[PDB]
């Protein structure tokens, strides 16, 4: 639409929210493949930050291609490598969600603030396969990666 379309040229960072993502229950409903920043550059944020960001985006982009195939083939028919790409991309999607302090009214769940280095570490670990053994639900609506490990422990007891 001409109004928001013309607005993009005026910004250094864009956080693009998406209805499809909100309807999946992911808040904040940020599109990871349509939000940008002029400082997303390894000479500015450092190579570790940049490499993890681009690795997350790569898995989520590869995930899109796989969803088209799944729509016909189903999940069980995928190769073990692809199922692993799907498993991890799904954990990543959910670890990108976060309880906001200001949203403690909708859910009743306490807001969380995650330091940068903690954010980088968590996604690094998911992509490296360090949590392939936990259910994706453990990564939904938490703060740092340690709350996911702990959420998986609560859910195991309730099982």
């Amino acid at each position: 639409d001409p109004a928001p379309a013309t607005t993009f040229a005026h910004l250094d960072a864009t956080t693009v929210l998406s209805r499809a993502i909100a309807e999946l229950g992911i808040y904040p409903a940020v599109d990871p493949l349509d939000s940008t920043s002029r400082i997303m550059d390894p000479n500015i944020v450092g190579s570790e930050h940049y490499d993890v960001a681009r690795g997350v985006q790569k898995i989520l982009q590869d995930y899109k291609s796989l969803q088209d195939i799944i729509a016909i083939l189903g999940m069980d028919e995928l190769s073990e490598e692809d199922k692993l790409t799907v498993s991890r991309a799904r954990k990543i999607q959910r670890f990108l969600s976060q309880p906001f302090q200001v949203a403690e009214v909708f859910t009743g769940h306490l807001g969380k603030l995650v330091p940068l280095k903690e954010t980088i570490k968590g996604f690094q670990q998911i992509l490296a396969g360090e949590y392939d053994h936990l259910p994706e639900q453990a990564f939904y609506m938490v703060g740092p990666i340690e709350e996911a490990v702990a959420k998986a422990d609560k859910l195991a007891e309730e099982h």
Partner: protein, 127 residues
């Protein structure tokens, strides 16, 4: 014009089979050859920002791909190889890079020279 001509062909062949890589097992070795070449040449098209290349440097890395010196190498290792191979040829084979520039072509003597350099570099690649 030498190396690009063949790379254009092989990417165009690969682009027709590219879907079969992501899901295709019992496929003939002929289409397996196109997929292996394609995924590797594709990696050579990747480039970081703010680092434009001298024509001779481009053709040296493209030569490596189109002559088949990457065919036995892992796709994840192609960029590592490209960077390493370029550092090697720049550091110690300026004379070969200079002539290819000046003449604007790869002579038979130049091609024989470049043939050996890639072969010897590749042989001691993964330390």
């Amino acid at each position: 014009k030498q190396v690009a001509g063949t790379m254009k062909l092989e990417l165009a062949q690969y682009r027709e089979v590219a879907a079969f890589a992501q899901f295709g097992s019992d496929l003939d070795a002929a289409t397996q050859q196109l997929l292996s070449r394609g995924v590797r040449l594709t990696e050579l098209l990747k480039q970081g920002q703010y680092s434009p290349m001298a024509i001779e440097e481009q053709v040296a890395v493209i030569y490596a791909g189109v002559r088949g010196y990457l065919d036995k190498l892992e796709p994840s290792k192609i960029t590592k190889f490209e960077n390493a191979f370029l550092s090697h040829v720049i550091s110690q084979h300026q004379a070969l890079l200079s002539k290819i520039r000046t003449d604007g072509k790869i002579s038979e003597e130049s091609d024989a020279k470049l043939k050996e350099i890639v072969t010897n570099f590749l042989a001691g690649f993964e330390a």
